[PDB]
Design a protein around this ligand. Structure first.
Ligand SMILES: Nc1nc2c(ncn2[C@@H]2O[C@@H]3COP(=O)(O)O[C@H]3[C@H]2O)c(=O)[nH]1
Ligand SMILES: Nc1nc2c(ncn2[C@@H]2O[C@@H]3COP(=O)(O)O[C@H]3[C@H]2O)c(=O)[nH]1
Ligand SMILES: Nc1nc2c(ncn2[C@@H]2O[C@@H]3COP(=O)(O)O[C@H]3[C@H]2O)c(=O)[nH]1
Ligand SMILES: Nc1nc2c(ncn2[C@@H]2O[C@@H]3COP(=O)(O)O[C@H]3[C@H]2O)c(=O)[nH]1
Ligand SMILES: *[C@@H]1O[C@H](CO)[C@@H](O)[C@H](O)[C@H]1NC(C)=O
Ligand SMILES: *[C@@H]1O[C@H](CO)[C@@H](O)[C@H](O)[C@H]1NC(C)=O
Ligand SMILES: *[C@@H]1O[C@H](CO)[C@@H](O)[C@H](O)[C@H]1NC(C)=O
Lengths: 452, 441, 452, 454
């Protein structure tokens, strides 16, 4: 058995081993700095440290079983996985974090749990869990805000523990800056100990500063160092939230810049008010219906195989209903749906009138068109989603009475999303299929004998 | 010493710039401290004098034995000879600032006494500090850590200058006169640095100013502290927005592709294949496409980056062995990079053949068994298959057998139309290619 | 009657339903936590709650009879509108917003308006009104600072009500952190209560913290949570205002970047000072006359039908004054004005000199040119708006004594805006028009035998 | 009749000379209206400066009623049409409202209330025009953005200082702990103490620091909460403007550093050899250090075709006229050929063209020192310098030539060069309008081949 690192079992393992790392950091620094809850609940921290050590042994023997991509394929040799695990420094950090340092409890009396600070070396696993969760989830900005709240909570708790350890080293209640005298039964409770030291670090690290002032030089130096660390950390968090917000509204900024540039251009060139109202309603439709991206730019970087699968998974059921593309080759149909290009029409906009130059084959997708008459609007046939027109104008049969003059008056009923297939893209895709090109020519010739 | 220092791939020059940076930072730090604070007492003056002699000896050694010997580029070619290097340093603008920095105003120690205000010309050698900072930004792997380090260093220097000016204001208003000034209880520089931090970070909790000079000082110091805190926040914002830009651009384009596929209701197998391609592309290249990077590079570096990757691999192909090297260079420039998922058919049996594939970082398998699943040969990285399809036209040759990808194979695809559009320039190589097509077909 | 969401009537209803939702949020948390507004103005809040419920059932009926978009057409059958409204979670949120929880007033004696907290669930109408106003209005940055001040004033008001509720739970006047004893006639007034709670929450959330320090564990924990919330609020405010300032001066930043890049190129290639100040004065004109963006880049994001309609509505009314294009066909006119190119000429620049190859045909739109005589200030004919030149040399009619050479020197008096119609552009627009190409050629042969 | 050009230097000097007293009127009219000891003590100075401001205001009306405006690209010089175009403008209504003679009421109140002179503040658009023209005129745009931000928040902080002193004068002096102290004490009653302590109060309020005494009254509480919301908005726009200044400062360096990081990621991907890796890195560091890092086809893309052609003339025409085959050709052909010239840069050690290569390019040397060497390595024959050229023969394609469009030389770049490349296809695309010059170029190349080898 070899666990795939890109699978779901490995991510569930990342959660089940990134819980005791956060446990080890948070509760080991409070157990080492307070010594009031370590002396109260010894069995609970013994059971939780035994479970964290069992999870760390399982972490070593699972991290020694994860595969890695060597030349595109997942390697499965366990000796190669064990040697690739041995040659890197994360095995050194794991074997340094899995030293049995708990045998020193027999010498110290188990009242000093700061000997378990070797177990804080597995922080790359927790950072890997945070990176994999913000990769996997669909709310990356909300997970980044939650991760920044968790980072400032870790830093607040570690600073509160550091302030209580410094207050224990100096002496409780001897000064005005330190934590007060714990022989008084009000300040001697563990709850007010932790919550007031958390309040002091909340006031200090966020650069508010309404604590009692330092009266000695060690307290002055610690408050200067602590204000400097707090202003650098909280300027980093405010810059991170600012960069995240400026990345969140960047698409709205770019779309509003495009709308304002087009509106300033049409205010400069004196375009009429009905056409301006039409194009502003078109951009409002384009924004409110979330079609602001375009196919030609969102399918730019993808390869032709995945673009072919995306194109045949939408267009092939409509192109196989087309009469002239009924019995052609599957690679020709893949290239034909690759050559399709989308066009969006407003309601009331004419697709083509009588006598215009016909060189595009329109394929209707999520829209409704109709062939109107010359003067008035009467509905001869209403073409629905999955219908098509424009095959004669792109076949251009020699000996035709049409003369590349696609017939009728086609206008849009609603907001249509037409996929056009031009003459140049058809003759570009039809170079490598000569007998299929000849079959298209005789199919158009039979259409010509049907249309006299 | 060598006759010429390269100053780009030389670590000894970076060590010397670190030494002159330590000298200049010693001047800019310990000149206001000795100017304001009473640490320059009559039994400690010899230590400051030995440090000042070592500092001026470092400055004079830099002006006399190192800065003439820097290599430079005039007219395109690198200059080597020491006479022209010395004349380039002498007619430079760094020599004017150096010779204005090393004016011996310490001769006036005999007239006016030991005063560190006369050494204020030594802080004009900031070009060595900026050159060392630019060299360390260019020689470090990740620049955001050094931008945070430089911002922290400028913040600590501004707070040190503010502590010195606050101790000067305390000496000007008298020590312990009002409640605003420094009182004299503990360490002078430590409590003045505490006042400078709590003022110029705009925190508060200090004693209020009493008279007009103290209120003007507190107003100007709090306004400068507001602007320093704003510059620190904007600097960290610019550093984070420059660091995460490629990751945010890749995530925005992947979100655009996922939103388009969910707008068109594309099913979960094709969506999983698109997300798998985007995940492996981010894990492999750390960028979407390389053609939009390479199309902004100039033609000679495009030529060299094409040659050192693929020129030997195309030179092992027996088809283009007799053609021209410039035609081979043009098909080096017009190669297209694709990444094929595992289990994907690159050339189905019976399908039209129009491409020549070069496999790099991957393994493909030719499925030519009786049932259609028995592998014949595993073409590893650096192989070239499908080279015979570049000469037939129209229908021509069909693909003989199914070939699938074993793992994440990054094929290099050359089309037939791009080969013909290259071949409209080279008629003799086109004649060689069509006569090779006639003798092989 | 079926309303459509893009109309003005739906936006007027969005205003009329975004009034009582904001009322419900603000004054329901105020009346829930203060207990003197509900005691004093009982009939006023009963009338306003009844009017909010009348607007809520009218909003339920409007969202029951609102239109959506399928196949580009506005859906008009109210049974399908009712099914599409009832199948989603907004109908569940409206029904949960209209549970009769006001029948507990006869149970508790009406002094508890906290049972109307289900009325806050209709927040999508307020967010939709904010998004539609940001789409509609022409001051997006001023509306964004108005939305930001309204959001942080809602949070400041909610935090003031939470602080007064916590002080009412703990006790009035028992500590230094809590609100004082309300039996004193100075601290007992409702205006003093609300404005001091607002001042407390502004000092807390606006990271200034001058409030007297906490005494007990609940007060310490609430101040820790409240200061961390204020740190996140300050980060959000700084990020939105910084991204808005970047969006406000991004156009000036990119034009300054292009100006300094062209200036760096001009001092890199060592151009003459007269050409450098000509480029500098042209960029000063291009910024002072708001012609910054380039029109071929502006007209790229639009579709082909709106591009052809805008190209007609700008260029065709000046193109039809050209006498060689009097009787051409409409599609030739459409692709002719689509393949036009506008340029702006500085004063003193020669458009075409005598003896140069005539490859472009220029028509004047909002300009004044003059035909000078051989590098002199003397002008023969001063051209004006609506005129043309360059039709003699573009067609290459056989029998030409000129031979494709512009025969006159033309200087620009002021800033002109010509339309550079190229020979290659006219030839590419004349591919699908062979009979109109021969008609243009015989018209040019007739006018060539007329003039020369 | 004299007409001042609005895009000239005299109009900008007038913008400075009229943006001084508007800014004076803002500062000292709100300070004289609120403090009431400046107006009592410096009466002669304020009457003289207000008379000078009114003289500058009527001269501003006389200048803005004579400045021109662009129609049809032409600067109109007809003063009657200029007066009509100014008369149909709302800025004329703002100016005639700004020059209402309120000195009758100002002497009726005893030359002691300058609150009546708040009509003079209506020329804010003139000061905004001055700041716009200075931020597009000066050479320090980021430093002027910082100075304009400092000046705007100084205007707001001074107005808040005047508002706080007016609120303290309305409520009472020393009746609370929040207000300004009792002015009967001669230390707290000095005018400098008044202005400096009120300015310090409004700075501590509007920058959200808070060392002020806490308010007592409800109106004081409401003014402090409104002033703290305005102050957190002011701190937000200060941090936003300084962050935008830093980003606009180092945007080009960050874009180049992201380009170098992308090139390093590509070279770590494709396993490029380390000698070529450090060659590309040293090449791009040279291109950044001598400020040519942006491609000139992307630099000159925003320029129109006439200015692009004139820049191409003024750079490349005096170098293209020195070429032997383009010595006697037409001016329009030379303008098209200097428009069609593309630049390429090289690094040391690279080959321009080798022996037996298909010659399709004509290289013109600029800022470089090439050398023609043999096949075995560095054996220099003739060091080629700046201004020279090669490849003018093999792109002409003379029929019957014994070389057959080859190179017959190995040309290396000793230092970094900046060559100019003229392709064969670009020469044929520029020679399609001059067939007589095409046959003349074939005749000159046939002459060169006849004197060399045939
Ligand atoms: N003329 C015509 N075209 C129709 C009709 N019904 C569907 N169509 C399609 O409508 C078309 C629009 O123009 P085309 O020239 O492409 O070809 C025509 C047909 O394919 C009909 O009744 N008449
Ligand atoms: N069928 C086949 N092709 C091979 C083998 N080894 C290398 N190749 C190449 O693999 C190919 C894949 O594409 P082609 O079908 O055109 O042509 C085939 C050969 O050129 C092999 O053992 N069998
Ligand atoms: N040759 C010539 N052209 C004139 C005259 N008056 C106006 N024009 C226009 O000036 C022109 C310059 O360009 P064209 O050769 O294209 O065509 C010419 C005419 O349209 C005139 O007297 N002679
Ligand atoms: N063959 C040759 N070319 C030279 C010499 N000196 C300068 N050049 C130029 O170097 C060239 C390089 O190749 P070209 O084919 O363009 O033409 C040649 C000449 O223009 C020389 O001594 N021999
Ligand atoms: C704390 O209080 C106890 C008794 O209240 C006292 O004995 C002890 O000295 C105090 N601690 C200090 C540091 O003063
Ligand atoms: C508030 O005041 C009243 C009367 O003045 C008193 O009875 C009450 O005890 C006071 N509250 C507290 C908490 O002391
Ligand atoms: C101000 O001081 C004077 C004398 O010092 C005193 O008479 C007067 O009442 C004081 N006014 C106030 C408002 O305190």
């Amino acid at each position: 058995i070899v666990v795939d690192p890109s699978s779901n079992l490995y991510y569930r393992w990342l959660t089940a081993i990134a819980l005791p790392v956060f446990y080890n950091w948070y509760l080991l620094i409070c157990r080492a700095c307070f010594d009031e809850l370590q002396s109260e609940y010894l069995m609970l921290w013994l059971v939780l440290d035994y479970s964290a050590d069992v999870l760390y042994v399982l972490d070593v023997l699972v991290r020694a079983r994860t595969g890695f991509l060597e030349q595109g394929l997942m390697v499965s040799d366990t000796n190669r996985l064990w040697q690739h695990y041995k040659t890197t420094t994360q095995f050194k950090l794991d074997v340094l974090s899995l030293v049995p340092t708990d045998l020193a409890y027999l010498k110290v009396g188990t009242n000093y749990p700061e000997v378990r600070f070797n177990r804080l070396l597995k922080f790359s696993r927790l950072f890997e869990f945070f990176d994999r969760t913000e990769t996997r989830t669909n709310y990356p900005n909300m997970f980044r805000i939650g991760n920044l709240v968790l980072y400032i909570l870790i830093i607040i708790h570690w600073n509160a523990c550091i302030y209580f350890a410094i207050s224990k080293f100096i002496g409780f209640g001897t000064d005005s800056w330190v934590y007060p005298n714990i022989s008084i039964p009000e300040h001697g409770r563990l709850s007010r100990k932790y919550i007031y030291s958390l309040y002091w670090s909340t006031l200090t690290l966020t650069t508010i500063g309404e604590t009692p002032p330092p009266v000695k030089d060690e307290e002055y130096l610690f408050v200067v160092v602590d204000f400097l660390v707090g202003v650098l950390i909280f300027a980093t968090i405010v810059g991170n939230v600012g960069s995240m917000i400026s990345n969140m509204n960047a698409s709205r900024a770019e779309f509003q810049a495009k709308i304002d540039s087009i509106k300033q251009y049409m205010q400069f060139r004196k375009v009429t008010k009905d056409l301006e109202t039409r194009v502003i309603r078109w951009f409002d439709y384009l924004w409110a219906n979330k079609k602001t991206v375009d196919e030609k730019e969102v399918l730019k970087s993808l390869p032709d195989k995945l673009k072919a699968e995306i194109a045949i998974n939408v267009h092939l059921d409509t192109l196989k209903k087309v009469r002239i593309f009924q019995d052609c080759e599957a690679g020709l149909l893949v290239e034909l749906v690759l050559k399709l290009r989308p066009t969006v029409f407003s309601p009331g906009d004419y697709i083509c009138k009588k006598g215009d130059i016909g060189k595009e084959m329109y394929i209707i997708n999520e829209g409704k068109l109709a062939v109107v008459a010359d003067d008035g609007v009467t509905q001869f046939v209403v073409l629905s989603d999955g219908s098509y027109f424009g095959e004669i104008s792109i076949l251009n049969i020699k000996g035709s009475k049409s003369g590349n003059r696609r017939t009728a008056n086609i206008r849009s009923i609603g907001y249509s999303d037409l996929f056009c297939l031009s003459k140049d893209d058809l003759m570009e895709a039809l170079t490598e299929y000569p007998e299929a090109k000849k079959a298209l020519e005789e199919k158009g010739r039979q259409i010509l004998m049907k249309d006299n | 010493l060598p006759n010429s220092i390269d100053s780009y791939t030389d670590r000894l020059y970076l060590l010397w710039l670190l030494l002159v940076t330590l000298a200049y930072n010693w001047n800019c730090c310990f000149i206001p401290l000795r100017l304001v604070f009473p640490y320059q007492t009559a039994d400690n003056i010899h230590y400051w004098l030995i440090a000042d002699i070592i500092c001026d000896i470092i400055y004079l050694y830099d002006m006399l034995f190192i800065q003439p010997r820097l290599q430079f580029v005039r007219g395109g070619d690198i200059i080597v000879d020491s006479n022209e290097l010395r004349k380039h340093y002498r007619t430079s603008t760094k020599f004017q600032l150096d010779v204005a920095s090393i004016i011996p105003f310490d001769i006036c120690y005999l007239f006016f006494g030991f005063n560190p205000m006369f050494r204020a010309n030594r802080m004009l050698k900031y070009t060595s500090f900026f050159e060392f900072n630019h060299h360390l930004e260019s020689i470090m792997d990740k620049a955001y850590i050094y931008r945070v380090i430089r911002t922290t260093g400028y913040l600590l220097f501004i707070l040190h200058i503010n502590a010195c000016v606050y101790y000067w204001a305390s000496n000007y208003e008298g020590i312990g006169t009002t409640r605003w000034v420094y009182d004299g209880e503990g360490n002078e520089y430590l409590r003045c640095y505490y006042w400078a931090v709590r003022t110029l970070i705009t925190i508060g909790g200090l004693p209020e100013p009493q008279t007009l000079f103290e209120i003007v000082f507190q107003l100007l110091n709090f306004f400068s502290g507001v602007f320093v805190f704003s510059s620190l926040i904007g600097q960290m914002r610019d550093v984070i927005g420059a660091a995460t830009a490629n990751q945010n651009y890749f995530r925005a384009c992947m979100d655009d592709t996922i939103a388009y596929m969910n707008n068109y209701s594309i099913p979960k197998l094709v969506q999983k294949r698109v997300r798998t391609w985007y995940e492996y592309t981010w894990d492999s290249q750390r960028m979407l496409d390389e053609s939009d990077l390479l199309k902004t590079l100039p033609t000679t570096v495009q030529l060299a980056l094409a040659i050192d990757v693929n020129f030997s691999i195309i030179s092992k192909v027996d088809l283009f062995k007799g053609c021209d090297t410039q035609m081979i260079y043009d098909m080096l420039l017009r190669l297209k990079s694709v990444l094929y998922l595992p289990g994907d058919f690159v050339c189905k049996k019976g399908e039209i053949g129009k491409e020549m594939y070069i496999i790099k970082h991957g393994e493909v398998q030719v499925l030519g068994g009786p049932d259609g699943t028995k592998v014949l040969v595993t073409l590893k990285a650096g192989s070239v298959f499908g080279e015979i399809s570049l000469l037939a036209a129209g229908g021509g040759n069909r693909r003989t057998a199914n070939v699938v990808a074993h793992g994440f194979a990054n094929l290099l695809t050359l089309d037939k139309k791009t080969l013909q559009e290259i071949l409209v320039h080279y008629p003799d190589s086109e004649r060689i290619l069509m006569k090779k097509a006639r003798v092989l077909l």
